[PDB]
Design a binder for this molecule. Sequence first.
Ligand SMILES: CCCOc1ccc2[nH]cc(C[C@@H](NS(=O)(=O)CC)C(=O)N[C@@H](CCC(N)=O)C(=O)NCc3ccc(C(=N)N)cc3)c2c1
Ligand SMILES: *[C@@H]1O[C@H](CO)[C@@H](O)[C@H](O)[C@H]1O
Ligand SMILES: *[C@@H]1O[C@@H](C)[C@@H](O)[C@@H](O)[C@@H]1O
Ligand SMILES: [Ca+2]
Ligand SMILES: [Ca+2]
Ligand SMILES: [Ca+2]
Ligand SMILES: [Ca+2]
Ligand SMILES: [Ca+2]
Ligand SMILES: [Ca+2]
Ligand SMILES: [Ca+2]
Ligand SMILES: [Ca+2]
Ligand SMILES: [Ca+2]
Lengths: 254, 142, 191
Amino acid sequence: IVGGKVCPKGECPWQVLLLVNGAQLCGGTLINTIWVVSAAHCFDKIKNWRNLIAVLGEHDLSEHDGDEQSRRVAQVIIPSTYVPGTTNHDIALLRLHQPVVLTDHVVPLCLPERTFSERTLAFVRFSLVSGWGQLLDRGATALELMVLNVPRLMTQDCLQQSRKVGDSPNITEYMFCAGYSDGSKDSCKGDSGGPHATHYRGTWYLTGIVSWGQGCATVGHFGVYTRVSQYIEWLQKLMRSEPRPGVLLRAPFP
Amino acid sequence: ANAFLEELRPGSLERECKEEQCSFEEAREIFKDAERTKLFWISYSDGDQCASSPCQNGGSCKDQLQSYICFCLPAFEGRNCETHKDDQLICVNENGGCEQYCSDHTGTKRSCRCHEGYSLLADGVSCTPTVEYPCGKIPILE
Amino acid sequence: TVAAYNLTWKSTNFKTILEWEPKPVNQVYTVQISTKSGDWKSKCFYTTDTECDLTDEIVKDVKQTYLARVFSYPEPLYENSPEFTPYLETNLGQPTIQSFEQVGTKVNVTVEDERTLVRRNNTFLSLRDVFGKDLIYTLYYWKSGKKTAKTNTNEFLIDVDKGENYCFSVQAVIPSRTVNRKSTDSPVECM
Ligand SMILES: CCCOc1ccc2[nH]cc(C[C@@H](NS(=O)(=O)CC)C(=O)N[C@@H](CCC(N)=O)C(=O)NCc3ccc(C(=N)N)cc3)c2c1
Ligand SMILES: *[C@@H]1O[C@H](CO)[C@@H](O)[C@H](O)[C@H]1O
Ligand SMILES: *[C@@H]1O[C@@H](C)[C@@H](O)[C@@H](O)[C@@H]1O
Ligand SMILES: [Ca+2]
Ligand SMILES: [Ca+2]
Ligand SMILES: [Ca+2]
Ligand SMILES: [Ca+2]
Ligand SMILES: [Ca+2]
Ligand SMILES: [Ca+2]
Ligand SMILES: [Ca+2]
Ligand SMILES: [Ca+2]
Ligand SMILES: [Ca+2]
């Protein structure tokens, strides 16, 4: 996170920490006791699929309290239409091997219904993005979970307000921009997979996933998040499906 | 207006334009100076655009120059107060007043719904948790 | 469909209607308005007209700068409108001289303080209630030679020659402004 602040312990209860071989990898979002939503690209270079760990109730990577819960990722479901090294369909559905315990420090973010999110949440100006990523573009990662309030823009406005960088990824209907173009606030690489939570009349809902952007908080650029509303039905059919033999699974999409 | 011989009488704004309708010529004879005549003629000849009673549902029309302004009653809006604020109970309008989910219904009225872990209250628009840790809620603040 | 264009703000005394083009041909419209940091509120749902009254929204805070956008239907196609700050841009309606009394060698011209669209405590605020000191009325009179006067209230106290008659006309004015600083001239009235 760039230009944000520390999420007080317990105020970002759905933030998930993803590890591979005990090492920090990415953020994620718990949406029920058994499933975690993250970004697909977080697995582009994974080789030890039996060594993926999802940690919930985390806050300070340097301390250890009893709010921490760990689980092995039993399955990483990425859309078939996703291409490693690219940006479209940047989403992953992780099945935890054993459910997590819901407490004051570990709670899931609500996955909303497609139309509610497109017709209502999408027009809620501000939403919170969070993670243990880089505090500056190319800097070290955060020790304490950071959170940032970012304003959303419709793609037409994003493009119009962004500086062209020949041969840069297209903003598709499966993405959307959020952030600022003055170089002060945006999410960063280390936050990949983290949530973009929208507050609406008392409840917080999952609307986006930290996916990509032109560097981190670059002038004339905004962050790009996976437009989760496009995958609601995708995520629901999978959560009701039987676990496959392997860890990695590519499910057709639509 | 003009009648037999009245023109012999000096000009009067009261008798010619107030108590009667006066053409530009008569008006010009009262103010003499061109500009003064124009300054008067713009308003005098504009005509009350509120005559047609354009403001609806009890609104109040305030005349302007070749136009008007409507002041509506609390429950109305629109150029002519034609919009019924109560006839806008559809989902796309502020989520139909629903707290969580909203479903339109051709003809009838929209219905409100909730996310798993919640139930629809008696007001038919709110949702309360039906479990200890419903999604989207932060314990250390509840 | 085709994105709307030439979006314009027609506003007088906070009566604010947004207009645009073209004449809907197999396409409907939906407006959204917001403040730079507020949420987007929809208006004039699926209207076939090329206008949208937003008075009720902008009178919530006339000093706020609003942004509106018109969506086209057969993310959808839209066009953003010019930013609009009510207090600084709404037009001042044509004034109305309420009256004038003569007292020897002086006359008290009274300017009827017209109402605005801004509500408050179940009533409409005057132009004075909103602009306060920012508003001044000016008188353009003559012994029915040119003469003028300015007041920071709704009345003009001036001198006059006994016997001769006077005509008057006033204009609402916001000196601080740059555009739309004055209203049109009120109708002419003579004692
Ligand atoms: C190898 C060919 C690369 O081609 C190009 C050419 C021009 C480009 N402009 C932007 C990108 C896209 C690229 N950005 S970059 O900073 O790495 C490069 C400027 C980019 O963002 N790449 C992805 C991974 C792609 C993968 N699947 O491997 C990535 O790093 N995502 C994480 C992330 C999260 C948040 C932010 C944020 N909230 N700002 C920024 C990054 C890009 C890629
Ligand atoms: C009353 O007169 C006005 C003049 O513009 C017109 O717009 C209305 O339609 C009519 O009712
Ligand atoms: C003019 O203003 C409107 C809003 C209503 O109050 C009418 O009764 C009044 O004449
Ligand atoms: Ca810890
Ligand atoms: Ca006559
Ligand atoms: Ca005559
Ligand atoms: Ca005459
Ligand atoms: Ca007569
Ligand atoms: Ca008379
Ligand atoms: Ca003549
Ligand atoms: Ca004559
Ligand atoms: Ca008129």
